[PDB]
Symmetry: C4
Subunit: 367 residues, 4 copies
């Protein structure tokens, strides 16, 4: 499996261009596994087009200069209001794999979310992170004991938070992977205690198929008790699941449609956020994801009730293209892109963004 | 008439791809008789896009495992909440014709609907049905006795329900058929009793022509008294017709626009179901059709007030590609596809699906 | 100037196809003068797409058979609720010019509207009409005497109503005609008196330029008083103009935007009709035009508050393809087309069309 | 650095202004051509500026007793032939050799107000030549150093500027994808200046520029009505609704969708200049009916400059006037005040209808 191995910074004019550029260095099956989404990919187009439903205003004479993008979340100072989303199998994009990404995230100065379906070990990622804050994302086992072990091992690694992803009890209808009969070209060290024998050669359907299908609120309570760490429930799109999660002991709400890779013919993630934030009414922090590509998106997410956003596909396309330097280039882009938007909207800091007016656009994408 | 005859299962990644796949093997006239719709087919595209007006929510920690797709309608236990739609002249799609389809539907475990314009005899379909349940769909003659005869034969063969298709009192303006100058290349045994000889060589326009134009509610009463069977009234888009049908004695309502093949410049069928369902007010069962293509459209219909759905073009496209096994592949796909959707929306059984929240998308297809 | 001369019936499948088909046998300039409209023709597209804002319901068990398209307007019995709209310079479409169209309309059994910018004389047209009813459409001269003159000639020739086209005090910005430097290849005998020459070699801007710009409500009183005939005011899109015209003695309101050939960046004509019909509140008859192409449109117009529609561009493509007989085929197409629609909508007669429920589509054209 | 703008001077036939964009791409150097035509991000907000005109639609009106409509109007004492003036734009040299002076002469002979950018490729003297006694407003980009502002404003009152336009929506550049991709470097210098422009602009800066210049000040870049309140309160004599032809903030609305709410907050306290997207008489009319007092034209004049110097520019100003004159006739507008009273049709379907 010929993954790219080249390391370097890259010019990021916009993050949409990176998809096509990565398509040229990443193996066909893997690239489309990274890029693709459920069905004819309509709900992924909605993730992207929802950004035009709410439009930013330029603001004049605001007494603003050198905006400060820093913020804080569960006591982690970070350089911008974004973090790295859990993404499986970075190996698919670059030989340095999760360590590559980790090192970029670490040096940028934000949080790395580690995925249960990681291609690399904790040890290999820890050396990439070099003491940087990390949270861990769990896809659960059926067997309770294996869950205690993963959470224990994750804690020993230093994870200061746990992410329950619950939107993937079975796989989404990912036509690209099915037509390419994709199977993972390496193992998943952390979870293979419950695939028992390698993830290599298996499809994402049997992997999700061996994880826990029958997740209940009790699982959120349980994980919080055992881990002793703050718990995010990730994949939420209906506000009712925000109440349920919080009542179950979640310390944060992660709004997300899994980048349209799960339930098809669903709304674009950003359209669900206001309602969810209104229900949460600031009881816990909110991380938002699924379709962020621009600083104008980070702003809009913040203005709409998110505390931070999680970045995914672009950072993977950066990795592919220049390893940890390519990824850092993408993180650096987002900060600078955000820094421009703050200046033109009268935002001195991250709290100002959360308070911005938004122009409602009933006409949508075609205007 | 060079129908395909090859029998086999097929991969089904989605049902849309089947269209182009069938055109390569089904001859020009018959293929376009099956695919196309009235006018420029704007309403057919409406049936497809209506699905994007109400969107599903993913639900999390719903305590759901191995969802059950079985439901019951008018005493029949069926494996999934869908039935086969009455479709004429399956010979256009495949040499095994209505028998092929019958075998698949019966072997899958759901109800077959028999078209009065079937290319095969009642006897030939029975072979195919090997005991499975059937409903009979009548295009009424003008002569009463001939209605009684047909209903009596239908009931003789085993029909447990009669479907009155009342939306075809004259043909829609099917441009593809006018320009191809399409005429049926074999006869219709159940109805030639009222044609100018045999249905072979005739346009659908004159066949409908030979059928009853002046259909009134007295006909619903008459069919039900005579047949002593449940009568569904089919082709309903407007709520008043549903009340009228029920007062006239109908035992179910069948929401349909005939796959856009009749009145042009009308709404997508799905946009009309809620208002019809409110007027029905759970007095009788509702079957929905016209545009179903995914498990998600199956769930959205039940959620909006149907009890089951009817499948059409997709099953025919499959039958063209692999006879009874091609058709079976398609039904199986709709079942697996529904199963995924139930799990992700947090529906343990079919009754849960009818209680689902939908997201209103006022932006429409382009979002 | 090489206009078509062939006379024959034609196969009309839909009226949209006729446009491209007439382009094959009509000289570039004259064709594009017929086909085009103001600006980028966005408002011509709005005229067509507005039909998708209100969608017809099919209705079942309506007890309808052989519907009757006949109707009556200001005491004229006619075979269908449509009339021929006034259009200049028919000789650009066909050698028989306005006499061929007259023959078509008269044989069909509806009303002919004569343009003041006709290229036939009153006697040539009158010959094709062989006694059929006619309405005369005036573009006013600046000089009062010449207005009295034209009306005297129109009443003497048989006209039973006068149509005041008032939406063209100056020309639309018709981009096709400027780029083609289009000018008329023959004279216009009826208005010649107030052009300082012959209409031959003149642009439509300079012709409209000679006509009265300063049309006021007194111009309506005066035409009524002089003619003694019922006066339609034509080009209305704003309800206030309906009040104004009726208050000035108009006996009819003709809703129109000149088939999008005048004011650019304006609504599709059909969207403007309900408001107008409400303000009119049945004080006088309403003719609708500007975009009619199908029987569904005729039904929607009548259901939205029109008594009749007027046909235009497609009748002229008809004339190009087969002179009076091609034209007749189009009228006969509209008659048949509306007949199917009445059958499926449950309309026995023309009055029934006026009471139809329409489904509201807020999603517009892409749905 | 090397720049080879077209130098031919001629009148052109303008059928519509959309066609001028591509026509001018055939005779303007690629880099500079796309500097003028391009916008931020993937230009969705520039497309938004154009499509907004389809949100409100004009009605034809009949028997309005109208003839020879009159497009003249008046703003802060200036009598102008049409309710449009020229927007402030930099680097006219990018379009034509005659640069700002060419545009000046078209604007002057036509009979409306030239607006002069601080970042112009020409001297006040070179521009005054083309202007030939005609009226001018000076648009400032503020420097950090107060003395330079005061010096540039004195200079501008010296040349005869009768208003000052403060442009506050460019505290940092838009994200112009084309310029980055084409590594476009500005080919000439800006002799009215000499980057470190004033980021931290406040209301106090409005007060100060009114107070020193002693001229009417317009605030330019407004898309939020609060900012109209802030401007009038700080002493602005005018409000200039603009998103900078979409060359600035991305993923924002089309300028014309924001106009009504601003007009409503302004309450005719000061006059309103509107811009960003104007391409037809139909748009001048809708801007006016939606609360504007005059519009500013930009890209289409420049494209006319490119194709025919002052005479191309002029052909464009001429086009708008005739185009607007057609619309007035068909809408029942005798004069420019009548346009501000026009009813508009609400189109909730959007561009696709
Ligand atoms: C290739 C890929 C792999 C992913 N793997 C995981 C995973 O293992 N666990 C998880 O919770 N989310 C996973 N996600 C979802 C992301 O955390 C996030 O929700 C998504 O990337 C946001 O969409 P965007 O990247 O298009 O902005 C994955 C997404 C992608 C594209
Ligand atoms: C080729 C074809 C033939 C049909 N023949 C009949 C028929 O004989 N009787 C009837 O009641 N409906 C008939 N229908 C309508 C179907 O019962 C059903 O309404 C339609 O196929 C559903 O739309 P879809 O297939 O596009 O989802 C036919 C539909 C198609 C596409
Ligand atoms: C080529 C052409 C010539 C026309 N000439 C006239 C005319 O002389 N007088 C008039 O009142 N309307 C004229 N009209 C407008 C028609 O009366 C009518 O409003 C229009 O054709 C309806 O639009 P449609 O043809 O797209 O349905 C003309 C329209 C066309 C297309
Ligand atoms: C190439 C270019 C340069 C510009 N330079 C300036 C400038 O220096 N100062 C300023 O206030 N506005 C500037 N603008 C904005 C214009 O004043 C005006 O707001 C814009 O042209 C309106 O967009 P439109 O011409 O596309 O309708 C510029 C616009 C363009 C396209």
């Amino acid at each position: 499996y010929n993954a790219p191995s080249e390391i370097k910074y890259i010019d990021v004019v916009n993050t949409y261009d990176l998809e096509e550029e990565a398509s040229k260095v990443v193996p066909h099956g893997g690239f489309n596994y990274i890029a693709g989404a459920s069905g004819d990919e309509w709900t992924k187009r909605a993730n992207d087009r929802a950004w035009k439903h709410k439009l930013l205003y330029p603001r004049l004479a605001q007494d603003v200069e050198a905006p400060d993008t820093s913020t804080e979340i569960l006591g982690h100072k970070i350089k911008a209001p974004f973090i790295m989303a859990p993404i499986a199998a970075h190996g698919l994009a670059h030989a340095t794999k999760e360590a590559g990404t980790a090192r970029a995230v670490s040096e940028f100065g934000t949080i790395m979310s580690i995925s249960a379906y990681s291609g690399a070990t904790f040890e290999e990622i820890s050396e990439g992170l070099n003491g940087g804050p990390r949270w861990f994302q769990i896809y659960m086992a059926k067997d309770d004991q294996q869950n205690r072990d993963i959470l224990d091992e994750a804690k020993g690694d230093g994870a200061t938070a746990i992410i329950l992803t619950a939107d993937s009890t079975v796989s989404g209808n990912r036509d690209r992977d099915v037509k390419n009969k994709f199977v993972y070209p390496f193992g998943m060290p952390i979870v293979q205690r419950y695939l028992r024998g390698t993830a290599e050669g298996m499809s994402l359907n049997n992997i999700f198929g061996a994880s826990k299908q029958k997740i209940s609120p009790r699982d959120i309570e349980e994980i919080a008790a055992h881990s002793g760490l703050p718990v995010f429930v990730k994949g939420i799109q209906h506000p009712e699941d925000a109440d349920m999660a919080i009542k179950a002991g979640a310390s944060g709400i992660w709004v997300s449609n899994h980048g349209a890779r799960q339930l098809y013919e669903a709304p674009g993630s950003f359209d669900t956020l206001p309602a969810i934030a209104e229900r949460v009414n600031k009881r816990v922090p909110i991380v938002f994801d699924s379709g962020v590509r621009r600083g104008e998106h980070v702003a809009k997410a913040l203005a709409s009730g998110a505390d931070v956003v999680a970045l995914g596909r672009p950072v993977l396309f950066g990795l592919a293209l220049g390893g940890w330097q390519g990824a850092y280039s993408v993180l650096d882009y987002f900060q600078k892109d955000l820094t421009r938007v703050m200046q033109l909207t009268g935002s001195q800091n991250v709290e100002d963004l959360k308070g911005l007016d938004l122009f409602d656009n009933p006409y949508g994408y075609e205007y």
